[PDB]
Amino acid sequence: CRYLLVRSLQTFSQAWFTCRRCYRGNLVSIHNFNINYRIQCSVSALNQGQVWIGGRITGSGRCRRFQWVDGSRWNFAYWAAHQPWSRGGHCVALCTRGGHWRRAHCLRRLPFICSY
């Protein structure tokens, strides 16, 4: 699957629709370990510690759930040590070092990975 690294810092809400607006796509949906590794190389040069991906924590009270924004199925993950509970907000972010995911609050301003 294709994907591009935007280097401008925007909130999750902003960042999703910039993909849909400027490049007409969605946030990246990762379904295997390889696509996750490729994305780690592309971002290994960023001084930023994290980047947004298409991870949105849905669910009601005590019903915390995960789901991609582009609708695809949730059939793979690569969480970090000490994740993803008891910390963070409802938007997932990939840690540039190692390639480990880590929940974060959506309104944080970080670069992102669009998929096209």
From Swiss-Prot:
Cystine pairs: 19-114, 91-106
Subcellular location, record wording: Cytoplasmic vesicle, Secretory vesicle
Residues in C-type lectin domain copies: 1-116
Protein's name in the database: Eosinophil granule major basic protein
Originating organism: Homo sapiens (Human)
Classification lineage: Eukaryota, Metazoa, Chordata, Craniata, Vertebrata
Residues of the full protein shown: 107 to 222 of 222
